[PDB]
Amino acid sequence: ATKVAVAGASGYAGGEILRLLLGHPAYADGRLRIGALTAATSAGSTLGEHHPHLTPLAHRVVEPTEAAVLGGHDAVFLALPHGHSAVLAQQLSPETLIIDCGADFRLTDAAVWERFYGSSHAGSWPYGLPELPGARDQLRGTRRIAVPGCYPTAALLALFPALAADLIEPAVTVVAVSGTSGAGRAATTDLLGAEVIGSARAYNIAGVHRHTPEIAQGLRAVTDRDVSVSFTPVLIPASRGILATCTARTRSPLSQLRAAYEKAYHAEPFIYLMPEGQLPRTGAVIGSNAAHIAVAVDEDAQTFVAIAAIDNLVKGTAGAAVQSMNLALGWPETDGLSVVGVAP
Amino acid sequence: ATKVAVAGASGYAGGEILRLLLGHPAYADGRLRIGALTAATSAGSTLGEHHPHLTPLAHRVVEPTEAAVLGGHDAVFLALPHGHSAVLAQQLSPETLIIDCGADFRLTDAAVWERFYGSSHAGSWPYGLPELPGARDQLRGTRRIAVPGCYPTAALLALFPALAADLIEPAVTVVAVSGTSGAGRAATTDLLGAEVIGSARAYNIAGVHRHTPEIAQGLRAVTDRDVSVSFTPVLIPASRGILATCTARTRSPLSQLRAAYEKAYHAEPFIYLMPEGQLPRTGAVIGSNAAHIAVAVDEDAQTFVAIAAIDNLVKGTAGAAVQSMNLALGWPETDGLSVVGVAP
Amino acid sequence: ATKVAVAGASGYAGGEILRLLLGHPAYADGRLRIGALTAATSAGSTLGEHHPHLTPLAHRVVEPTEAAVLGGHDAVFLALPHGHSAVLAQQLSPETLIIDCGADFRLTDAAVWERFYGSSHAGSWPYGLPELPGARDQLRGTRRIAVPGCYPTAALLALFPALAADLIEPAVTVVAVSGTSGAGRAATTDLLGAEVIGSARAYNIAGVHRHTPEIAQGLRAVTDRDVSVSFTPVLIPASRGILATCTARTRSPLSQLRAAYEKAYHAEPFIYLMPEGQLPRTGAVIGSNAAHIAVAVDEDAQTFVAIAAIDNLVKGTAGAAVQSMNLALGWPETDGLSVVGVAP
Amino acid sequence: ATKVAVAGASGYAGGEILRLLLGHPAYADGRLRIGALTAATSAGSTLGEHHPHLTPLAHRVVEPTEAAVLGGHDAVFLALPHGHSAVLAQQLSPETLIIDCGADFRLTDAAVWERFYGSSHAGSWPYGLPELPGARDQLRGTRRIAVPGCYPTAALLALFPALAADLIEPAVTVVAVSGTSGAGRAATTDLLGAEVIGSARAYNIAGVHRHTPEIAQGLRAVTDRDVSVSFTPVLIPASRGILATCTARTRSPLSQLRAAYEKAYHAEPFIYLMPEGQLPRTGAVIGSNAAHIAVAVDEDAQTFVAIAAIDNLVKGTAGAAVQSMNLALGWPETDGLSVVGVAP
Ligand SMILES: NC(=O)c1ccc[n+]([C@@H]2O[C@H](COP(=O)([O-])OP(=O)(O)OC[C@H]3O[C@@H](n4cnc5c(N)ncnc54)[C@H](OP(=O)(O)O)[C@@H]3O)[C@@H](O)[C@H]2O)c1
Ligand SMILES: NC(=O)c1ccc[n+]([C@@H]2O[C@H](COP(=O)([O-])OP(=O)(O)OC[C@H]3O[C@@H](n4cnc5c(N)ncnc54)[C@H](OP(=O)(O)O)[C@@H]3O)[C@@H](O)[C@H]2O)c1
Ligand SMILES: COc1ccc2[nH]cc(CC(=O)O)c2c1
Ligand SMILES: COc1ccc2[nH]cc(CC(=O)O)c2c1
Ligand SMILES: COc1ccc2[nH]cc(CC(=O)O)c2c1
Ligand SMILES: COc1ccc2[nH]cc(CC(=O)O)c2c1
């Protein structure tokens, strides 16, 4: 039996983890039990007040986020803002599996963490991107997992096959558009529907976004060159979805690149290379754990270009948390995680 | 090994049926296989060229909609425009399970079919609304099913308990808002995203809309009274969803009306009537076969109010279709049919 | 040269008064100047931090809302829609023209006010709905205006001609779909883009909505009979717009009804009657002071149907404010108000 | 009094042109008169059936697009489907001012035109982008105007000052998100409401887009060096808007770059630099002829970043046309083109 808690269940990330715990085959056959669901200000309320789409768990009472509530669980999902997984994992048994969606344990460079996040660095856990060279090995059987950010996921998948193959220059440029739900359920004026509907805006530009160094970190894991990352995230009128455009100087032929991408991904269950003439679209991956990827070559401009479409709440967080949890617990990697997206 | 065919596979209802089949527990242990996938002018093309979310069936070539093609399939789903299933049915073998998403076999009065469809009445098949009184027994083991339209499913599910209780009057009004997908994939110009985004409009008003008599028909099955229907559809900037507001004169206490809906729906797997103080929203049901329902009384205006939310492609078309296929084959009714919406 | 202040210049209604003044002919030829722009919080900040669409005023420094700062203005807009403003009005000299966007002074029945608001009734001022019978003559030269609510502008305009000609029954049904901008700038989670995008929901149903008596009041102004109102508001992924489906039982012919609406509107320059075979859509009036109206008869249901579309921040709020202000000052009524929408 | 004819009056470009003239001061006093409104297939329709938002022109009868009809007008706008306007162009009088929104007369290099347009090159007319250096001078008194593409307008105003100041390296990247209207009014199934809503997708990537050569061109006009452009457009669920993110390497301080954009843009009425700490957004410029630019520097990436927002129908097409018509006829450059957009 595997009893699972979720800290921050009243937020988007937590809702997305529960939808999938609901659909997990380990749930339907009882090898998985949904234990405690906690929050902060919303403790004492029913979950239907927050997640009216998770009707099976609507009667559940949101408990306070305390080590005393979260003890006695084999697995413990952390879907709260960064800074809390530090203290909170220090309070649980060593053998319980902790899956943190925050950024606390993502970066390996303490000085980068302080420059970008503005707090002390808690260290690093295995990185919940199984598709990354070497990462899958490190998830198998572990008990501490750090889920990647929603932007670094789309980009690394897009870029790492070419940079590891040495078919593109190590200075990359990423311009991603995201749906609103990647900002989180905290009520801020600038994420009101009246404001995002019919309006696009780029934010945190010129390399100040905290995901800039996360993409950098991962690409440096496939190369020995100096890596450079111009990241620019763009907010568009959508609830979910991440469409990441990724360019970098190349002199290799599209022949060689397309072959580079088939090798790295032909056996990946979740990565789907588009047929020629096709190009990813976010709307086709919504609600699925899949990533759609097209590669091309702008030879007039000696520019490689590669597009990834991922759902930011699944492959971008909760799907990667569940996928990492399948590996940590030794269950089939795809348990609970469909590749069939909900469309239109 | 139930071998299934889907005529009109490249349509919205066709892809939603296929999406659902791909997640059916029968497909997973092979008691179900996906067979011919047929269309009209898009025959010869691949399915991924139409449904990029259905990557497991993207390599499939869609064949023409011909008896030779459809034959030798135990179940055939027909997702064509009307005027086609009438002849396709005697052409197929009598023992195949035929399920028409269209309207050709929905209605039971020939004067009404002519008055609204301009063609000859085809007659009548069992109606795909298992929750309607007496429907389940008619579906168990039939081999011919007409699936309800999206709007009648909403209106009926919202009104009939209080009308079968004789607690409201039989002159109901329904104003249902709906996403764009119910209009289907045919490229009209007032369904272009530029004219749909940021605009709402009512169409087919004053009771010329073909769903009006279908609702009238469904409501007449639970009352001996003379029923009248004012029905108004209003298209809104959304890809999925149907919010149906239905009002009727009543002088019954709220308590008795509430009781009549709990008696009607407590044991119903896909019908979830909201806690007191919550109200349905479409986003809560999307991707899922649920209907979220709420009732209230406008004491001043002496008016009952029922609100209903259903996904227009799942519970209004393919979910009902698959739900009735489960019944016609004697499979657990909820198989492949989730009550958990994809939200936000 | 009339000085103009705007109390609550940072919210939506406030920003849309300024947009309209910015493009008002008196503002161009010096007759009109734009004085103090106050707010509760966010005072000390620039207006461009709030309305980056109003670049000309971007430098302006938002001030506190006090009788001090508001004193010394020929006209003062109280843009805290459906809030409170009675206290401010008593700290201003009676010679100052005050146009209140909120509902403090709309209602004519203290008992109804207390019942629906829980406050002491401030009393009543001329209703800013010029097309209403008798409304325009009470605005001419007035020093106190109450701008009507977004929904009752739509419903009154749709319904009163039929009602006044005694061609429909006084028990009416109105269902209105509306964009998120009517909820205001008030930060709240149920109004986040991720929430609103992709979903619809009726809220505040079955009599509880505060515009219900506002609709009753306007109708009782054109009939001596007792009027009930079933009003249902519905949220939709739009930022602006109000499409109101309004119904009442009738026995009068289509021709009698269509004539009544042309007798009432051929002179009114903001009401455009749809040609035979057309229907309102909100997309066609956005950013405009127009109301687009169509009428029909469901003969089977014995039901009148009227559809009206307006912009919820223009003809529904700021447009009514300015249109009435023009009249208050003896300026031409159409000054600065276009009937042409920015579409698609 | 200048008689004007719009050809393509039934399409998005056409109706936005007509919205502008209706608001034009030259229309209000009589120096401008709206004449024949023609379409390719819509002849015999009234204009309201196409543009319900231009109610003042609703009664106009759409005529066929033939030289006989278009003759007798001083100015003639050509909003004809993406090209094939050169025929019509030589069939009108040579003293008749024609503004072409198509692309047939934009390009300079016949070799580049054939490569991207598969057709023989018709020649080049003065580009209708006054902010481009030396461009305003060739528009004064012109009788041949080619309006820029929606995308080049953005990228050029985003990039040209820094390239002209020789501050950035002339290999530039552009990844622009855009609403659906820019694709025009032709009904594909890929522009269907259901499909663009909730989905992003890059299209025509890796240098196949016909705006890439138009971007290279304008940039070639401000520099000695050879310019290569990497242009990615991305469709988003919006109706109007373009948000162009443009990068290139730079070896300058942010200070020099801002000092170049202030130098270029302090005197141009429609180009709005953002206050330090503010970044552009599309919802702010919608319905106006404005363009909001901001520049930054990612020092660790040695990258210059310029963000530009414009309304794709106004500054991107129909506004540019009207603006260039003002210069053509010797009227003030801002006549009929506000800088204040319609938001939220
Ligand atoms: N959203 C995404 O797409 C995404 C992608 C990748 C990673 N993540 C990560 O997932 C985590 C959750 O973000 P979100 O998008 O879900 O935001 P959210 O919707 O607003 O919810 C965040 C959750 O954190 C809880 N919480 C806040 N402060 C807390 C505190 N002191 N103690 C305990 N619980 C607290 C909240 O409970 P209350 O209701 O009581 O406030 C809430 O349930 C973040 O760390 C994020 O980095 C998110
Ligand atoms: N979509 C909904 O929300 C919904 C809900 C409830 C019920 N329904 C019903 O489901 C049915 C399907 O409509 P839809 O929404 O899916 O619209 P749609 O997207 O246009 O689908 C139409 C499908 O039927 C095929 N088709 C068209 N004409 C054909 C012909 N002569 N012969 C054979 N195949 C033909 C088309 O193939 P080609 O590509 O070759 O043209 C296409 O695959 C309708 O009758 C509808 O009333 C729909
Ligand atoms: C707060 O602005 C937003 C809006 C949408 C978003 N989608 C994904 C993110 C990641 C992040 O910046 O945290 C994000 C941020
Ligand atoms: C015609 O535009 C629309 C928009 C949304 C819709 N949902 C369902 C339908 C068709 C119908 O079932 O009548 C429909 C049509
Ligand atoms: C969710 O709350 C909303 C949403 C949209 C709206 N449009 C107009 C209003 C006024 C009101 O309902 O009080 C409104 C309120
Ligand atoms: C072709 O699909 C699209 C979708 C959205 C668009 N917005 C602007 C354009 C102009 C262009 O690319 O020609 C466009 C095209």
Side-chain angles (χ1 to χ4, degrees), chain A residues 1-32 34-89 91-131 133-344, chain B residues 1-188 191-344, chain C residues 1-81 83-223 225-275 277-344, chain D residues 1-2 4-69 71-81 83-89 91-94 96-261 263-299 301-344:
Chain A
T2 304
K3 194 177 177 184
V4 188
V6 173
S10 58
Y12 290 152
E16 194 54 23
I17 283 178
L18 296 162
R19 186 173 81 78
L20 295 172
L21 293 189
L22 289 184
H24 210 269
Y27 186 78
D29 83 346
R31 42 164 197 210
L32 206 172
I34 295 186
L37 302 133
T38 59
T41 59
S42 98
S45 82
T46 42
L47 195 89
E49 276 165 86
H50 317 262
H51 298 315
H53 61 307
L54 310 176
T55 36
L57 296 183
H59 65 286
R60 287 304 200 92
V61 196
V62 157
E63 296 185 61
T65 59
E66 293 168 3
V69 195
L70 300 146
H73 295 99
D74 310 296
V76 181
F77 281 100
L78 294 186
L80 345 92
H82 81 77
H84 294 86
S85 64
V87 47
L88 206 31
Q91 309 195 214
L92 291 184
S93 64
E95 203 42 28
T96 59
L97 152 68
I98 303 201
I99 290 154
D100 173 20
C101 308
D104 304 66
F105 290 94
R106 295 180 179 165
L107 306 203
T108 64
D109 213 300
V112 184
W113 168 270
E114 304 173 328
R115 287 257 174 84
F116 282 79
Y117 280 88
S119 61
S120 316
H121 189 235
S124 325
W125 291 344
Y127 195 63
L129 198 35
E131 295 83 359
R136 188 166 282 121
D137 291 328
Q138 272 218 118
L139 302 176
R140 302 198 141 94
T142 181
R143 335 295 306 165
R144 298 279 180 287
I145 301 243
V147 201
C150 41
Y151 288 117
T153 302
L156 293 159
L157 289 201
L159 279 154
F160 94 77
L163 192 87
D166 194 53
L167 290 183
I168 49 138
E169 266 300 283
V172 301
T173 293
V174 171
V175 179
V177 292
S178 171
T180 57
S181 68
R185 191 169 222 180
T188 287
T189 285
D190 289 345
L191 315 166
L192 289 165
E195 290 269 17
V196 317
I197 288 162
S199 183
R201 69 169 178 101
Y203 60 95
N204 294 351
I205 74 179
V208 307
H209 198 283
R210 322 217 172 106
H211 285 172
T212 315
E214 209 179 328
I215 314 175
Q217 192 167 277
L219 303 160
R220 302 212 213 83
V222 315
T223 185
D224 39 30
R225 278 169 155 91
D226 302 339
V227 178
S228 180
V229 173
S230 170
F231 177 58
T232 291
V234 178
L235 177 63
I236 57 118
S239 41
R240 277 146 166 270
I242 282 185
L243 191 270
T245 305
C246 290
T247 71
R249 304 298 295 289
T250 189
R251 273 141 84 80
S252 306
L254 172 71
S255 325
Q256 220 162 306
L257 283 139
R258 216 171 271 292
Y261 273 76
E262 291 259 354
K263 195 152 121 201
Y265 289 152
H266 76 268
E268 276 310 324
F270 288 123
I271 328 296
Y272 171 88
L273 284 201
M274 314 286 316
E276 190 96 37
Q278 275 170 56
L279 282 172
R281 65 178 64 181
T282 50
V285 296
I286 292 314
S288 84
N289 195 40
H292 289 189
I293 303 197
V295 295
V297 160
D298 184 340
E299 270 319 355
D300 268 351
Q302 301 146 86
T303 293
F304 176 62
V305 50
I307 307 135
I310 69 168
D311 177 325
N312 68 276
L313 288 165
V314 199
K315 192 51 187 160
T317 324
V322 173
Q323 192 178 338
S324 304
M325 160 203 98
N326 290 331
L327 293 170
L329 302 177
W331 303 346
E333 206 187 313
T334 42
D335 272 21
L337 298 144
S338 169
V339 308
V340 196
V342 192
Chain B
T2 295
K3 201 197 186 184
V4 173
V6 168
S10 64
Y12 275 161
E16 196 55 11
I17 293 163
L18 283 175
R19 192 182 78 88
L20 276 165
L21 294 169
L22 273 161
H24 198 286
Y27 178 89
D29 66 356
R31 31 198 203 176
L32 191 157
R33 293 182 183 174
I34 306 216
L37 302 176
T38 81
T41 80
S42 64
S45 84
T46 88
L47 200 71
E49 299 173 33
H50 303 279
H51 307 301
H53 55 304
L54 306 182
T55 44
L57 322 179
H59 58 286
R60 293 281 187 99
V61 179
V62 317
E63 304 155 284
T65 316
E66 289 159 11
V69 168
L70 286 178
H73 290 86
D74 303 316
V76 167
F77 291 87
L78 304 184
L80 313 172
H82 65 290
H84 283 108
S85 38
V87 47
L88 216 31
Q90 53 214 131
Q91 216 176 350
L92 306 185
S93 149
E95 292 175 329
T96 88
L97 168 56
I98 302 167
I99 301 175
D100 189 13
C101 286
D104 288 312
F105 287 97
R106 288 186 195 158
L107 315 182
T108 49
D109 180 12
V112 190
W113 172 275
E114 280 145 35
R115 186 188 161 187
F116 286 91
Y117 280 86
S119 53
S120 267
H121 196 212
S124 148
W125 292 356
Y127 201 56
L129 204 171
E131 288 75 24
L132 263 207
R136 209 158 273 129
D137 314 310
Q138 288 176 24
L139 297 186
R140 279 182 196 106
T142 183
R143 291 295 172 274
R144 305 284 192 261
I145 302 157
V147 175
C150 35
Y151 291 116
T153 298
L156 288 173
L157 286 173
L159 287 158
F160 90 75
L163 177 82
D166 197 353
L167 295 181
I168 49 164
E169 270 149 28
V172 301
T173 52
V174 174
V175 176
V177 307
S178 151
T180 42
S181 61
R185 210 155 215 188
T188 324
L191 287 144
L192 297 159
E195 183 65 13
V196 174
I197 285 142
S199 182
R201 81 195 158 75
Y203 58 104
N204 294 344
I205 66 137
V208 313
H209 191 289
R210 292 164 171 165
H211 285 180
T212 307
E214 187 162 348
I215 296 139
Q217 171 169 307
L219 294 174
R220 287 190 209 107
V222 316
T223 182
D224 36 5
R225 291 220 152 70
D226 293 341
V227 181
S228 50
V229 167
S230 177
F231 170 58
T232 306
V234 173
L235 155 71
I236 61 179
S239 58
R240 282 184 180 207
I242 278 173
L243 196 283
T245 299
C246 327
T247 72
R249 194 211 151 175
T250 189
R251 298 263 265 143
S252 321
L254 184 62
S255 62
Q256 205 200 345
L257 293 153
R258 280 186 91 72
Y261 278 68
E262 269 139 11
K263 178 193 65 227
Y265 285 156
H266 77 297
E268 276 294 342
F270 304 108
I271 305 276
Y272 177 84
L273 62 80
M274 316 291 302
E276 253 166 278
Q278 289 164 41
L279 289 177
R281 56 193 71 186
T282 43
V285 286
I286 290 205
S288 88
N289 204 43
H292 290 190
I293 301 201
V295 311
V297 171
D298 185 341
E299 285 214 35
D300 282 21
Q302 293 172 5
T303 286
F304 177 73
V305 190
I307 318 281
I310 59 163
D311 180 332
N312 80 275
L313 281 161
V314 185
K315 183 41 163 184
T317 189
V322 160
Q323 199 185 342
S324 315
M325 176 216 77
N326 283 355
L327 281 170
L329 300 174
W331 289 356
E333 201 194 306
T334 55
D335 263 8
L337 293 160
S338 184
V339 290
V340 195
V342 177
Chain C
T2 75
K3 252 89 43 90
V4 146
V6 175
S10 35
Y12 287 142
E16 195 65 353
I17 297 173
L18 284 175
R19 192 188 73 92
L20 293 173
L21 296 167
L22 266 189
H24 192 284
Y27 177 84
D29 71 7
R31 305 197 278 210
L32 183 47
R33 305 184 202 168
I34 297 168
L37 311 167
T38 59
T41 322
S42 82
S45 66
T46 59
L47 203 78
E49 308 191 53
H50 305 273
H51 302 309
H53 66 297
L54 316 164
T55 44
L57 308 178
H59 55 289
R60 294 300 199 94
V61 182
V62 169
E63 311 201 57
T65 316
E66 307 182 38
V69 190
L70 283 173
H73 286 97
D74 296 306
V76 186
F77 283 95
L78 290 196
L80 342 146
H84 84 75
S85 75
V87 192
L88 261 207
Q90 186 131 289
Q91 324 196 299
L92 280 187
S93 195
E95 303 283 319
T96 309
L97 153 71
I98 298 146
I99 304 108
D100 176 49
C101 275
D104 268 19
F105 298 93
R106 305 184 195 149
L107 297 198
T108 61
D109 197 345
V112 176
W113 173 271
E114 281 145 26
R115 159 184 188 197
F116 275 99
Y117 280 83
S119 42
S120 316
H121 188 229
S124 64
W125 295 347
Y127 204 57
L129 194 14
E131 305 80 344
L132 251 192
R136 195 177 274 123
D137 286 28
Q138 264 168 56
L139 290 182
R140 297 243 191 55
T142 210
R143 289 272 96 91
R144 292 292 190 287
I145 296 166
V147 190
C150 40
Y151 291 101
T153 314
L156 287 171
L157 288 166
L159 281 168
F160 90 77
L163 189 57
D166 202 44
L167 300 185
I168 51 157
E169 289 241 324
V172 304
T173 288
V174 159
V175 155
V177 304
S178 178
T180 290
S181 80
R185 283 277 268 234
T188 189
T189 62
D190 221 6
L191 267 302
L192 285 183
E195 292 292 325
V196 166
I197 272 161
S199 151
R201 63 194 178 83
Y203 60 104
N204 281 340
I205 73 183
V208 288
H209 196 288
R210 286 159 172 193
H211 289 177
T212 318
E214 200 172 324
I215 285 166
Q217 174 167 307
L219 297 175
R220 272 183 256 279
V222 327
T223 194
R225 307 208 197 221
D226 239 319
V227 169
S228 35
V229 169
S230 193
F231 172 68
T232 315
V234 175
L235 250 203
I236 58 177
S239 35
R240 307 166 160 239
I242 287 218
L243 191 83
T245 298
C246 300
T247 46
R249 261 196 92 236
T250 192
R251 249 147 301 300
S252 293
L254 193 46
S255 77
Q256 200 168 19
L257 288 156
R258 255 158 209 192
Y261 277 78
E262 279 141 32
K263 186 145 127 208
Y265 286 150
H266 73 285
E268 299 282 356
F270 291 122
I271 320 303
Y272 170 88
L273 281 202
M274 301 315 297
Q278 267 166 71
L279 294 176
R281 62 192 72 211
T282 36
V285 299
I286 294 288
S288 148
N289 210 61
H292 281 199
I293 297 190
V295 308
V297 155
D298 186 338
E299 288 183 47
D300 274 4
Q302 279 188 293
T303 303
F304 180 75
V305 171
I307 288 129
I310 61 178
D311 191 310
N312 90 101
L313 280 176
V314 195
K315 183 36 150 179
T317 301
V322 168
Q323 185 190 350
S324 278
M325 173 203 82
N326 289 344
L327 289 159
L329 304 181
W331 299 359
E333 208 185 326
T334 42
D335 259 22
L337 308 191
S338 199
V339 317
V340 190
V342 177
Chain D
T2 308
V4 184
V6 178
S10 49
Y12 286 149
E16 191 61 6
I17 294 189
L18 286 168
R19 187 178 75 86
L20 283 190
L21 318 172
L22 286 174
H24 201 283
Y27 177 93
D29 62 9
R31 33 198 207 183
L32 205 165
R33 297 232 285 202
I34 294 169
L37 318 177
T38 65
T41 65
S42 303
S45 317
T46 69
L47 188 68
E49 312 165 7
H50 303 292
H51 306 293
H53 60 295
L54 314 167
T55 49
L57 304 169
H59 57 286
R60 289 303 180 102
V61 178
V62 168
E63 257 150 299
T65 321
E66 271 148 24
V69 188
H73 300 87
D74 319 354
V76 164
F77 292 90
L78 292 193
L80 288 202
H84 270 127
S85 102
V87 201
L88 212 57
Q91 293 209 49
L92 296 171
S93 153
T96 294
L97 154 63
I98 59 198
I99 289 104
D100 184 29
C101 313
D104 302 279
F105 285 99
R106 292 176 195 162
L107 291 205
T108 287
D109 189 317
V112 153
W113 164 274
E114 303 190 37
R115 196 189 158 185
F116 283 83
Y117 285 85
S119 61
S120 302
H121 179 245
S124 98
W125 292 353
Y127 215 37
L129 214 179
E131 298 70 356
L132 260 184
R136 189 169 291 101
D137 276 319
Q138 322 162 43
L139 296 175
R140 289 175 177 108
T142 192
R143 311 301 281 197
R144 292 305 182 268
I145 307 194
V147 171
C150 50
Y151 286 106
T153 307
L156 293 173
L157 304 168
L159 288 165
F160 93 77
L163 191 54
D166 204 71
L167 298 178
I168 50 165
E169 283 276 84
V172 310
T173 304
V174 171
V175 170
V177 316
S178 158
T180 51
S181 62
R185 217 172 183 172
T188 326
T189 54
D190 277 271
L191 301 177
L192 279 182
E195 317 266 28
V196 317
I197 284 168
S199 193
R201 69 200 173 73
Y203 68 96
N204 287 20
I205 73 160
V208 304
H209 206 291
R210 294 164 175 171
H211 282 175
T212 326
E214 229 177 276
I215 293 168
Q217 182 172 289
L219 292 193
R220 259 164 221 141
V222 309
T223 187
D224 273 350
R225 310 170 161 68
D226 289 292
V227 309
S228 61
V229 192
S230 156
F231 170 51
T232 316
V234 171
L235 182 52
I236 54 169
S239 206
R240 306 154 165 242
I242 289 188
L243 192 273
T245 310
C246 312
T247 56
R249 294 252 198 70
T250 204
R251 270 205 309 211
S252 297
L254 174 61
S255 35
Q256 300 202 4
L257 294 147
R258 290 201 59 96
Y261 274 60
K263 181 144 187 155
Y265 289 144
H266 80 287
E268 298 269 6
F270 298 110
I271 311 280
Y272 183 72
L273 274 200
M274 304 291 326
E276 183 84 16
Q278 287 167 58
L279 288 176
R281 78 183 46 176
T282 55
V285 297
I286 287 177
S288 92
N289 203 43
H292 297 345
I293 318 307
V295 313
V297 152
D298 181 337
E299 268 160 83
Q302 299 177 50
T303 312
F304 168 79
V305 171
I307 318 297
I310 54 174
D311 187 318
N312 70 279
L313 274 188
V314 194
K315 183 73 220 151
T317 293
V322 162
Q323 198 188 335
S324 306
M325 182 211 80
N326 278 351
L327 286 181
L329 305 159
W331 308 341
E333 190 151 342
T334 52
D335 269 9
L337 303 148
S338 210
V339 84
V340 200
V342 177

